[PDB]
């Protein structure tokens, strides 16, 4: 029985360590600090869809370089909400963290925003074939080597085993030098927690040196 | 998979023995090859000094009277089979002789298994005894069924 973290399988060999920091006589305040800031943007992203939240430890000041799909949706009205939740995070963890911003375009190349946004886009009464084919057409048509999205579990109520992993194109699932983006989310409708998991293997980088 | 052979050993400590080097390869038990080298060299001095004669001639006559020819290879159509005659190959010859002389001679019961094992090999030097009794034993069981299971294999 196998299944593997694609996002942890390729991490550190071709993928990047999403949490950077020095370490450290006290790794505990770093670990819980990064989890708590990950839930800080996690709570502050009910409608922004920040597809990654990198925080950097910088000698008594965090550099929480929060990425975002749309810039001004979390970037505030020209500096209002970003300074507000930023300073509020400064009095939320204890370190005055000058949180930067990021503009993630190409939503078919963003894993958690496109898949999780497909899931909440399914939570509004959207069907399994309509949600999966619709995400395969928007993000599946957006440009990538292959995106395969499936919403596995409760959908339709009874006889709960439902695995429609509808997705096409090539997939470096076992190609260890592929560097695919593959993260899932969890939608919680009225029938039950019937979440979705999809990855979009955009393309590998050829190894070289000089 | 085919016949995947094995490697042998180098020449012995005293002196340039190779088949006796395999005798030291069987001489240990539980890995600690130093105790086996000590008991084997003690058999060399015990049988070459006591019982005044050589060493390679004494072992060549013990295993030379120990290395069997025929052996029993089982088979049948099912229940009540026939123990066929299956003669030894060369390395099966020296291996079977090392098994009979080692496992018979080290289980004697003298004051030591080293000197007593040398006494078992010395009694085996007379073309009989424990190891030679086993070579006559398997040499006698085969050829008891050598008239029926001979031309089957």
């Amino acid at each position: 029985g196998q299944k593997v973290n694609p996002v942890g399988l390729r991490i550190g060999v071709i993928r990047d360590w999403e949490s950077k920091w020095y370490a450290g006589k006290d790794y505990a305040d770093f670990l819980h600090e990064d989890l708590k800031i990950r839930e800080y943007i996690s709570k502050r992203l009910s409608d922004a869809s920040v597809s990654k939240v990198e925080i950097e430890r910088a000698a008594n000041r965090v550099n929480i370089t929060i990425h975002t799909a749309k810039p001004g949706m979390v970037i505030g009205k020209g500096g209002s909400e970003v300074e507000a939740l930023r300073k509020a995070l400064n009095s939320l963890t204890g370190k005055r963290v000058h949180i930067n911003i990021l503009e993630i375009k190409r939503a078919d190349l963003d894993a958690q925003l496109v898949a999780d946004n497909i899931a909440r886009q399914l939570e509004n009464r959207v069907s399994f074939r309509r949600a999966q084919k619709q995400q395969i057409q928007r993000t599946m048509r957006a440009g990538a080597q292959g995106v395969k999205t499936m919403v596995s579990g409760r959908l339709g109520g009874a006889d709960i085993a439902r695995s429609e992993y509808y997705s096409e194109g090539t997939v470096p699932l076992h190609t260890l030098r592929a560097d695919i983006d593959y993260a899932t989310s969890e939608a919680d409708t009225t029938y039950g927690k019937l979440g979705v998991k999809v990855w979009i293997y955009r393309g590998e980088v050829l190894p070289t040196k000089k | 998979k085919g016949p995947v052979a094995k490697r042998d050993v180098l020449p012995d400590p005293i002196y340039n023995s190779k088949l006796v080097s395999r005798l030291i390869n069987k001489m240990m038990i539980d890995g600690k090859k130093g105790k086996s080298q000590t008991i084997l060299y003690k058999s060399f001095d015990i049988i070459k000094e006591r019982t005044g004669n050589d060493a390679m001639e004494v072992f060549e006559q013990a295993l030379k009277n120990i290395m069997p020819v025929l052996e029993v290879k089982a088979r049948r159509v099912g229940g009540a089979n026939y123990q066929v005659p299956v003669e030894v190959r060369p390395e099966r010859r020296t291996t079977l002789g090392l098994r009979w002389l080692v496992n018979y001679a080290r289980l004697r019961g003298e004051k030591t298994m080293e000197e007593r094992l040398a006494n078992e090999i010395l009694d085996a030097a007379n073309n009989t005894g424990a190891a030679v009794k086993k070579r006559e034993d398997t040499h006698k069981m085969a050829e008891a069924n050598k008239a029926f299971a001979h031309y089957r294999w």
């Binding site: 550190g12 360590w17 950077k20 020095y22 370490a23 950097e56 430890r57 910088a58 550099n63 | -």
Partner: protein, 102 residues
Amino acid sequence: MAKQKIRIRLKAYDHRILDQSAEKIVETAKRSGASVSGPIPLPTEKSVYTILRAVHKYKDSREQFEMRTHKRLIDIVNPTPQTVDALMRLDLPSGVDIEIKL
């Protein structure tokens, strides 16, 4: 003999921050006088510690995460007090440990 040489040893999470960051850290040693020593490579210690990789059962099917952390060192020769006090202008990397050990 010599003098107590000023050189900050580097500690990093991965191995490329100590390599490249040790490179530009030699770029701080090109100026400020002279005598910046080369890459004295540290032991590069790791830690291997595995947990039970199942929810409740499957006690044999474990998993072993293991994350090592070691980086090279650099100790300069010529004193250069203006560059020695000028070593506080450290810009990179994001994950790296500098500590002027002299």
